[PDB]
Amino acid sequence: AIAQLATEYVFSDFLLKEPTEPKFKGLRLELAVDKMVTCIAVGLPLLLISLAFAQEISIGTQISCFSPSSFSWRQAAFVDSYCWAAVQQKNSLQSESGNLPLWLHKFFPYILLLFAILLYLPPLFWRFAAAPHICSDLKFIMEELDKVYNRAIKAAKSARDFKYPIVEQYLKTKKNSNNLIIKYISCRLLTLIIILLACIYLGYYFSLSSLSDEFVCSIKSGILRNDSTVPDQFQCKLIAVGIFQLLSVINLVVYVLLAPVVVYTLFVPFRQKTDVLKVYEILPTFDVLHFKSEGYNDLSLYNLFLEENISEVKSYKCLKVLENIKSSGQGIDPMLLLTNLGMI
Amino acid sequence: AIAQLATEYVFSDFLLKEPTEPKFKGLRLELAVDKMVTCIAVGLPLLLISLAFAQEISIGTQISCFSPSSFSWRQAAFVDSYCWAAVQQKNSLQSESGNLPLWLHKFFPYILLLFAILLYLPPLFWRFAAAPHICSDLKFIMEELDKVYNRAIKAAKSARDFKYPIVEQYLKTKKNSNNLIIKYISCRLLTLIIILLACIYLGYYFSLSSLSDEFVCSIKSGILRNDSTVPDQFQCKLIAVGIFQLLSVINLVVYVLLAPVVVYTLFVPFRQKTDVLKVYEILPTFDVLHFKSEGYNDLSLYNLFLEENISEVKSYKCLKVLENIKSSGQGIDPMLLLTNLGMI
Amino acid sequence: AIAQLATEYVFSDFLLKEPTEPKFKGLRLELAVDKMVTCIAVGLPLLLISLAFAQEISIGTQISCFSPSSFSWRQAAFVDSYCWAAVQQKNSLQSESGNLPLWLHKFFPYILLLFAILLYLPPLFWRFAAAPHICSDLKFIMEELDKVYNRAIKAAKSARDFKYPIVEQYLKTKKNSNNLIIKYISCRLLTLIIILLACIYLGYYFSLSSLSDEFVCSIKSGILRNDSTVPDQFQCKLIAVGIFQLLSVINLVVYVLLAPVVVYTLFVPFRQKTDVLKVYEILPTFDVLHFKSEGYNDLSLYNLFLEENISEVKSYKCLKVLENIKSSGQGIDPMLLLTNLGMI
Amino acid sequence: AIAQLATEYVFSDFLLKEPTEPKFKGLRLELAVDKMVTCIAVGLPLLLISLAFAQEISIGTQISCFSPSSFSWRQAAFVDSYCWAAVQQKNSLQSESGNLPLWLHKFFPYILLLFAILLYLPPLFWRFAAAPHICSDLKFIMEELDKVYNRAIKAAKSARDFKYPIVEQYLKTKKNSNNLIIKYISCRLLTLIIILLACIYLGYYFSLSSLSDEFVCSIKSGILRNDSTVPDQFQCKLIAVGIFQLLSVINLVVYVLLAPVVVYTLFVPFRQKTDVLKVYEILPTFDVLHFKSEGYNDLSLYNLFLEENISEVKSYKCLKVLENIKSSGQGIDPMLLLTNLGMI
Numbered sequence A, B, C, D: 001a002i003a004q005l006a007t008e009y010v011f012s013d014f015l016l017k018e019p020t021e022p023k024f025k026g027l028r029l030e031l032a033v034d035k036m037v038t039c040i041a042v043g044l045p046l047l048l049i050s051l052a053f054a055q056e057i058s059i060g061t062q063i064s065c066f067s068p069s070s071f072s073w074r075q076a077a078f079v080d081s082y083c084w085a086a087v088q089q090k091n092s093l094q095s096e097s098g099n100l101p102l103w104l105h106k107f108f109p110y111i112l113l114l115f116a117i118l119l120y121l122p123p124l125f126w127r128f129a130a131a132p133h134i135c136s137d138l139k140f141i142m143e144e145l146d147k148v149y150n151r152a153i154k155a156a157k158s159a160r161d162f163k164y165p166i167v168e169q170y171l172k173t174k175k176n177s178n179n180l181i182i183k184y185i186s187c188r189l190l191t192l193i194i195i196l197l198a199c200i201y202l203g204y205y206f207s208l209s210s211l212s213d214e215f216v217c218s219i220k221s222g223i224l225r226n227d228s229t230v231p232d233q234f235q236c237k238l239i240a241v242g243i244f245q246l247l248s249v250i251n252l253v254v255y256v257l258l259a260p261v262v263v264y265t266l267f268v269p270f271r272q273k274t275d276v277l278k279v280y281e282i283l284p285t286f287d288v289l290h291f292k293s294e295g296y297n298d299l300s301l302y303n304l305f306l307e308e309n310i311s312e313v314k315s316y317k318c319l320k321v322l323e324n325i326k327s328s329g330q331g332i333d334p335m336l337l338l339t340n341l342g343m344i
């Protein structure tokens, strides 16, 4: 049913499942824009395939050949099945557009599934090769931030009654290596390349004459060759090709809307904005240094992932509360922090 | 079965699922009127699609063409499938109303699913882009309110035997920025625009002549062109078009009933009523200031979400009990609060 | 299968599911008579729809038209499907009873599902708009009653070795406002109105001539108009209309049995009986005042919901044990209470 | 499949599900004989319905009409479906036995499902109206018995190193009111009445001539009336009527075996036997009084439910161990109790 496919592929959490494992607990490991680009680019061809054969849009078989009236039921079934299998054998069928449109019309679901798989591959490579590396580091950074917050408020609480910037040094180190960022821009670049190839294929397929689904087929190989009761050629038509083209144009539109999103995603430093650690600079136990910007290096990628997963950090939430209050400038940062009383 | 679709789409918790995650625990993050508008505007086209092809309303195929009596079973099947695929090819079919009604009749389920998806998109954008931002802030506000209540009753209990309005300052800050409110009114405005476009389409479709489902179809392209045994044209009829129109008028009625609800939702300040924090003004540890009204700013949105999710706050419940008792004015607020004894 | 539908709609907990949420834990929030009225009025039309097309009661298609013998299989299928779609087009079919019976016969499942949905709507509005408001208040009242019981037995225990009637004042306040009660009687009144409209429709439908399922149909629009091989008119019959009428009379009987139940439910003060708080009057820490009767106000509704959900209250259970023992009058209330020793 | 229905309706826990709720934990609330009577009287008609249409016992359609040889496939299908729908219209069909056997043959599954539902109704009324009332009281009685046992062994333990019979007074009070017992005998009496009505109907139906499934049917209303190619009348036969009668006699046999069980259940005092509290009379902290017998009052019903659910009571188990040992009379009750050492 149409509504079942709708639920399964947009309303269900299709490709939105969090990693079912206690190693990454609440950690996203895939940027929201990347998760939605993957969800679209993968589920749309699948949702389109499932629609192209919805039981109410499909009239029946995928091909019909119009055997003569003298032909029995089973002879007509033979003609249909033979021509269906004969869209490959170029000698049997004669089509005005060519044999390539026939191949594309028969194997359109396979090609869409191929595009879905190829578009799922880069997110899979990211989830397996580079997601744990960033997950461990991000979990460590969040733990260290919570610890420095607790120590800062404990020092402030003792005042109301070591000191090494380890996380800052770790991020300074991340500023050097660029392995994770080249992995990220490589998976994004393969996603963009496959999306553009899919756009090219879908634009070509939609550009077909729309009469290329009608091909002349001749069951005259083998012992049927010099047979006389069988006519020389049959007029076959590939049903559901109009549906294929109407769905291919939808896929092409969505993909050419998605490609600018991927291209923008490709520029990872430009997206690093709203410096997340700047809110921590108001802590005594934390050095006054953001030092996170301007590079095609893993530091910018970590900045993005921190900007995403930082809302889970309670200390960040309270510090951002104080920072927003500081916009008015009524009281003072350490006083409001001591008032806070939120170690964990 | 009809009853299965009924269960799935009204009696089941379709699109009423709470976010399956411990980040938002009992927090709604979608106003009840917005949740019901989404549920209706999305499930109704899906429920209608599933009904339009219920096994007891569908007689069989979606098209029937009445081949001549001389035609065999398979030749008639070819005529049916050819004309079904030929509602697209404008050269083959001749219809009094035009080819556009034929397109709309064949692809009515697809268009309804498209409307369902487009109507689901703004709630999805709200759930992903702006729901966590409001969720963290609302959870922090509820925690701070419980904390101030506990501190107020502890001070009162010590009397029977810091002091910074942090949440008030946070809300004062929210009064300034308007990012969340423009996100909210933007998703609501896109919902209204898509609902109005769906109303326009459904009113047009229902306005079709009701004989536009009968089209004359000619299987005479290719080698069949100069064939003589095949008649010049066939009288095809698109079954289940009357069902499509009867369901389109239902969808249009429900949508023109839903559009005023969305328009009213669009006026977020007007809906901010029954000042929820006013009940907290009777606490000594809480400054005597509501300061939440009159603006197209995120403060009004936060007021709505607080009015919704505030029933989960135990301190709010007890304070509202005292406030309602105060209507009689028998005793006194601090005495009844000390009697209360409900820290958590 | 018949037995599967039987299980699903009477033997399963259909529409008897407790709210899957920790906000209301064991709280009913829907009076037993209201829950059963909803279950009947909603599941009966669904159970009837599912029966009307049980695979053993359905002979096959919903319509049969008796084409001539010369007509091929596919031509007869065209006649059947055309007339099925032509019960709408009033020009094609000529029926003695009229076109309205034909519409009602084709769309009987849709009309029953519509009645099921409309009858489910008021309980849904109650569950979403007014159920949490009463749930929070009822949970607070139960907690306060358990607390006053514990304090009374602690005072009695200290004797064997504040004092503000907060819940009594809260109920006195509830005695004033009538928002919840007008919401309740409004949902009940809409339920009664929809039940009466369903009774009217089902009584009309069952009153049909029982030969209105036989209609004369003419496939002579379009190019078939002046065709000669096709006969002027076909004798079609809507199968499963007798089943529809036999099920409509069952639905009408059950609904006219249900309507007095809803009318009685409408009189909420009359149903407030067996004063539940009267059992608490034997506590020293509880003022000697029931003060719950005689009004179209939210207090009577709260009395009903307390009478329903009060069995979950342990203190109420023990107090009712003592009250029943007091019928004999052998010992004394405070002595038996001290003996009780059931703080929680 | 037959074996699937067998599993579902005898081997599965069909209608043996414990109440899925923490209010009644291990409490039966339905006497074993009543639970089995309900299970039989409800699942047997359902199991019979599912068997009457098992895919291997059903040859195909439920009716076959033997159109002439000249009739096409679709004309014969029309005759079959018309006569199927025409068992209702008394003018069309002429049967030797009458139209009532035809009605009963077509709607036999519906009538069996109706009997299953009506037989499920009294157990449902008991489970909803009177089960919680007895559940709370029984749980309280079990808790009080465990408490009195603990206090008795604590007094005995202190000897080796208040005093109010509250549960006895509660049962003395139960001896007065008869609301629960009239509810119980009323649900049992409705069960017996419905079982007897089902026996009457099944004995009548099985008494049919077994040729009443063959009826003469005439498709000659409407424009077919004066038609000549259609014969005057068709010989239709309702297949699966022999299966219906063979299953109706099985249902009747099981029901006339079940009716004496229900009649015996109706005599609730006679079933109150093996005085369960008599085992508690050997406790010092428990008064020496059974006081539970001889009445059409709720006390006898509570005696039955205690006899059923008392095995869950650990104190009862240990006391019955001591009572059985006392049959030999070797030692002494208080000494063996002190030896016991089973407070909980």
Ligand SMILES: CC(C)CCC[C@@H](C)[C@H]1CC[C@H]2[C@@H]3CC=C4C[C@@H](O)CC[C@]4(C)[C@H]3CC[C@]12C
Binding pocket: A196, A199, A200, A201, A203, A204, A207, A256
């Ligand atoms: C990502 C964006 C740019 C994609 C836009 C669609 C492009 C790729 C589509 C739309 C129209 C298409 C063309 C339509 C027709 C022809 C003629 C044919 O003999 C060769 C292919 C060719 C030349 C197609 C190549 C692909 C094409 C240019």
Ligand SMILES: CC(C)CCC[C@@H](C)[C@H]1CC[C@H]2[C@@H]3CC=C4C[C@@H](O)CC[C@]4(C)[C@H]3CC[C@]12C
Binding pocket: B196, B199, B200, B201, B203, B204, B207, B256
């Ligand atoms: C939201 C509310 C206002 C929607 C009401 C339905 C509207 C959009 C519907 C109802 C009747 C419809 C009209 C009916 C007939 C025609 C004639 C046709 O040649 C062009 C479209 C046109 C002019 C339709 C446009 C859309 C229409 C005006």
Ligand SMILES: CC(C)CCC[C@@H](C)[C@H]1CC[C@H]2[C@@H]3CC=C4C[C@@H](O)CC[C@]4(C)[C@H]3CC[C@]12C
Binding pocket: C196, C199, C200, C201, C203, C204, C207, C256
């Ligand atoms: C709730 C109770 C009162 C419902 C009882 C059923 C009522 C509503 C039914 C039973 C018989 C029905 C009538 C039977 C026949 C006709 C004649 C027709 O030309 C107009 C409708 C009319 C007049 C029906 C109106 C509805 C009706 C009166």
Ligand SMILES: CC(C)CCC[C@@H](C)[C@H]1CC[C@H]2[C@@H]3CC=C4C[C@@H](O)CC[C@]4(C)[C@H]3CC[C@]12C
Binding pocket: D196, D199, D200, D201, D203, D204, D207, D256
């Ligand atoms: C619970 C026990 C007593 C049930 C035993 C089955 C009874 C109810 C059955 C068995 C035989 C049946 C009888 C068989 C034949 C006829 C003749 C018919 O013209 C009227 C009904 C009547 C008179 C039946 C009435 C019901 C009947 C007496």
Ligand SMILES: *[C@@H]1O[C@H](CO)[C@@H](O)[C@H](O)[C@H]1NC(C)=O
Binding pocket: A222, A223, A225, A226
């Ligand atoms: C069929 O007959 C033709 C006659 O020209 C001949 O050339 C060909 O070889 C024959 N093929 C078979 C399968 O006999």
Ligand SMILES: *[C@@H]1O[C@H](CO)[C@@H](O)[C@H](O)[C@H]1NC(C)=O
Binding pocket: B222, B223, B225, B226
């Ligand atoms: C069919 O015959 C006609 C005769 O006018 C001719 O014009 C046309 O080209 C022929 N087409 C084919 C497929 O041979």
Ligand SMILES: *[C@@H]1O[C@H](CO)[C@@H](O)[C@H](O)[C@H]1NC(C)=O
Binding pocket: C222, C223, C225, C226
């Ligand atoms: C059918 O023939 C009749 C003859 O009177 C004519 O009036 C009508 O216009 C014709 N219709 C078509 C579709 O040719």
Ligand SMILES: *[C@@H]1O[C@H](CO)[C@@H](O)[C@H](O)[C@H]1NC(C)=O
Binding pocket: D222, D223, D225, D226
């Ligand atoms: C059928 O013909 C007979 C001839 O006596 C006539 O009485 C009857 O009215 C006719 N019915 C129709 C439907 O024309």
